[PDB]
Amino acid sequence: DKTVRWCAVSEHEATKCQSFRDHMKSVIPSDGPSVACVKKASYLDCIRAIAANEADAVTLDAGLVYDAYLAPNNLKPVVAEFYGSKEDPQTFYYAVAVVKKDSGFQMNQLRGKKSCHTGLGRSAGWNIPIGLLYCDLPEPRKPLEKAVANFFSGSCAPCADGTDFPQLCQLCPGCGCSTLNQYFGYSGAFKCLKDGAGDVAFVKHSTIFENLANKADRDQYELLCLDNTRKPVDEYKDCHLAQVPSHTVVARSMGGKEDLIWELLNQAQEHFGKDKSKEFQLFSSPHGKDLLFKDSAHGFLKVPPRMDAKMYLGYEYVTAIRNLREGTCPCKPVKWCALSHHERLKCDEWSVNSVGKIECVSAETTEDCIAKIMNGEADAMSLDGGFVYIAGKCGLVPVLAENYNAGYFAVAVVKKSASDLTWDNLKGKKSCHTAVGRTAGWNIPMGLLYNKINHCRFDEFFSEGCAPGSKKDSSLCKLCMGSGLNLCEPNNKEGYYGYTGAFRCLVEKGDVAFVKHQTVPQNTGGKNPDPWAKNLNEKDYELLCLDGTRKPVEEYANCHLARAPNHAVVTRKDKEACVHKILRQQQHLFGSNSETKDLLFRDDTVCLAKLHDRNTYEKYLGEEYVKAVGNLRKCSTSSLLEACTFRRP
Numbered sequence: 001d002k003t004v005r006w007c008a009v010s011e012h013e014a015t016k017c018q019s020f021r022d023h024m025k026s027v028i029p030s031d032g033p034s035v036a037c038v039k040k041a042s043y044l045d046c047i048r049a050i051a052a053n054e055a056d057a058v059t060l061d062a063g064l065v066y067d068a069y070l071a072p073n074n075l076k077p078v079v080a081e082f083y084g085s086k087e088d089p090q091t092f093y094y095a096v097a098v099v100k101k102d103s104g105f106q107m108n109q110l111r112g113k114k115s116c117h118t119g120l121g122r123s124a125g126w127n128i129p130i131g132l133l134y135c136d137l138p139e140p141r142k143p144l145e146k147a148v149a150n151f152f153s154g155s156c157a158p159c160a161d162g163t164d165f166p167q168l169c170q171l172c173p174g175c176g177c178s179t180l181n182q183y184f185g186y187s188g189a190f191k192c193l194k195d196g197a198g199d200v201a202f203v204k205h206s207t208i209f210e211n212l213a214n215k216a217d218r219d220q221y222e223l224l225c226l227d228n229t230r231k232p233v234d235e236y237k238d239c240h241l242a243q244v245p246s247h248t249v250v251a252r253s254m255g256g257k258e259d260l261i262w263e264l265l266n267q268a269q270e271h272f273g274k275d276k277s278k279e280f281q282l283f284s285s286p287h288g289k290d291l292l293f294k295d296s297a298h299g300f301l302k303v304p305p306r307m308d309a310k311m312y313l314g315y316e317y318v319t320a321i322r323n324l325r326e327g328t329c330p331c332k333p334v335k336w337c338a339l340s341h342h343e344r345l346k347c348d349e350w351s352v353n354s355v356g357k358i359e360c361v362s363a364e365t366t367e368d369c370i371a372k373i374m375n376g377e378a379d380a381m382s383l384d385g386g387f388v389y390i391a392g393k394c395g396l397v398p399v400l401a402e403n404y405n406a407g408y409f410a411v412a413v414v415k416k417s418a419s420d421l422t423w424d425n426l427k428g429k430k431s432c433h434t435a436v437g438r439t440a441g442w443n444i445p446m447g448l449l450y451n452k453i454n455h456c457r458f459d460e461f462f463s464e465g466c467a468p469g470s471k472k473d474s475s476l477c478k479l480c481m482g483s484g485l486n487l488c489e490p491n492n493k494e495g496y497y498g499y500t501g502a503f504r505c506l507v508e509k510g511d512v513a514f515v516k517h518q519t520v521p522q523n524t525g526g527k528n529p530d531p532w533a534k535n536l537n538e539k540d541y542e543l544l545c546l547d548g549t550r551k552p553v554e555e556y557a558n559c560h561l562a563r564a565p566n567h568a569v570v571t572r573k574d575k576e577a578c579v580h581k582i583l584r585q586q587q588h589l590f591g592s593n594s595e596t597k598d599l600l601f602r603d604d605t606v607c608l609a610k611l612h613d614r615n616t617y618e619k620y621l622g623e624e625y626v627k628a629v630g631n632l633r634k635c636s637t638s639s640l641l642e643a644c645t646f647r648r649p
């Protein structure tokens with residue numbers, strides 16, 4: 001058997017699950033998955049049951065998704081309910097802080113204001129705002145209501161203990177926890193702001209649109225962003241307190257059975273989903289409310305496999321609820337993340353030389369590092385421009401740029417003896433790329449190529465090549481050099497990976513190499529002692545210009561594909577100022593006055609440059625870079641980018 005043991009927290013849910021199980025037997029063959037129904041007393045008991053391998057799946061609210069993640073449960077979200085349109089699936093809501101336009105305060109100025117909450121104990125209206133504000137609350141913070149009552153000068157916190165903490169009901173006397181209170185619920189908390197009772201309303205992103213029809217009235221309101229900035233109310237995706245998943249199915253991190261659960265649920269919706277009008281409806285409960293799933297759901301989406309719980313809830317949500325659960329308050333040391341075995345050792349030397357200012361965490365992949373920076377396990381790392389795009393679309397920001405002397409020049413290099421080649425026709429040639437999705441060796445060359453050919457299936461534009469990161473069966477892996485499972489992989493164990501590796505690929509197999517303007521000079525004329533490069537002469541290679549002509553290697557300024565953005569340090573926005581200081585101070589002490597090659601920082605970097613103007617990824621990379629990368633995503637799967645595109649399309 002291959003059965004999904006579904007968990008029920010009530011006797012009505014168990015009856016739903018049993019009807020579920022029986023109706024599935026009629027639409028799924030013997031080859032497919034079955035339902036079994038485990039009934040426990042509570043969602044926590046279900047979580048412990050799934051972790052103890054006594055059940056397989058349950059669907060939880062976000063707060064319980066957090067509890068399911070913690071040790072020793074270690075559950076992960078696998079399937080998400082969506083709501084509204086099939087064309088526009090709404091999987092998350094946004095907790096926001098609405099304010100009146102031109103009221104003159106930011107998130108870090110909330111103390112002493114007047115607040116409107118949807119209700120004590122609710123997510124958007126209490127748990128998230130108070131969780132994020134927890135360390136700003138006066139001491140003692142137990143009980144929590146007393147601390148909030150001594151933070152906001154007066155509030156409307158429905159369901160709060162107004163007898164003991166009357167400040168919490170100054171704007172709705174009695175703190176009535178019923179719609180009899182005009183300022184209760186999601187509309188009421190907003191009305192508390194509209195009517196002028198309060199200064200800020202902690203609500204969901206859609207309340208403002210549900211209670212104000214005209215946009216003219218909606219331009220009188222703004223949102224507080226966590227960076228102490230405001231934005232308009234329809235920019236909640238860039239100015240919220242937390243992005244919360246509505247209702248998501250969790251499963252064991254190892255031991256699945258994610259594959260089975262999705263197959264079961266996906267076929268369940270195709271047969272008993274919304275508007276299928278069978279005798280059994282998946283999202284209906286003839287007796288009860290929201291049994292197994294929210295009755296308002298319209299279907300299920302499969303959660304991308306890269307996604308863990310901290311990443312799916314988001315950094316701000318996890319921060320807020322962790323503050324509520326544990327209640328621990330203190331630039332700190334900067335946790336730099338490293339990759340290879342050789343790269344972590346350089347960081348250790350840096351850490352002891354920094355005297356505590358720098359610490360070191362490590363991962364196996366750049367994407368694993370990027371993930372650790374999102375959820376707080378790490379703070380900063382230096383990234384290729386293509387990874388800055390990934391990191392930016394995951395909410396990270398560039399802080400400093402590595403300067404090598406505006407940016408460097410991306411070039412296309414050919415062997416001069418082949419005077420046949422020209423930029424105007426490389427169809428059916430042999431290409432050598434640094435890796436897939438990188439600035440010099442992919443995003444700039446293949447971005448330009450997309451405009452002439454109108455697709456990103458470069459496997460059938462070139463004859464063959466080596467572009468590490470491609471699928472191992474691809475023609476763009478046939479010229480690669482790594483052996484075993486190292487063939488075509490984007491790491492050091494593939495000899496044609498990187499700036500120099502791509503050049504070596506041109507020297508030994510390829511017709512054209514896409515690199516940076518320093519590559520060919522750095523590896524010719526005996527400068528590179530390796531046997532493959534020791535006897536090469538820079539004069540034997542030329543650059544392909546956009547003209548259609550060719551020019552010598554040293555004349556890259558007038559024979560360049562484009563100007564490339566240099567590698568940059570990325571971190572999350574709440575650490576931008578701190579990394580900006582500690583690093584620029586470490587740079588003034590260990591700067592322009594690695595053992596292997598290109599460890600932690602590129603080895604041709606003079607200093608880490610101030611940014612100011614270009615402090616976001618679209619501003620740093622540029623309009624045409626992000627536009628080109630947008631086309632190239634149609635043919636390239638970065639599983640980390642797939643997870644971040646699930647939260648922020």
Ligand SMILES: O=C(O)CN(CC(=O)O)CC(=O)O
Pocket residue numbers: 012287288289
């Ligand atoms: O809790 C119960 O079991 C009672 N039922 C109503 C009934 O069975 O008449 C309420 C309900 O579950 O909606």
Ligand SMILES: [Os+3]
Pocket residue numbers: 012287
């Ligand atoms: Os009943």
Ligand SMILES: [Os+3]
Pocket residue numbers: 341342
């Ligand atoms: Os080694």
Ligand SMILES: [Os+3]
Pocket residue numbers: none
């Ligand atoms: Os693979």
Ligand SMILES: [Os+3]
Pocket residue numbers: 489
């Ligand atoms: Os592989």
Ligand SMILES: [Os+3]
Pocket residue numbers: 560562563
């Ligand atoms: Os130019």
Ligand SMILES: [Ti+4]
Pocket residue numbers: 384385438439440567
């Ligand atoms: Ti690069």
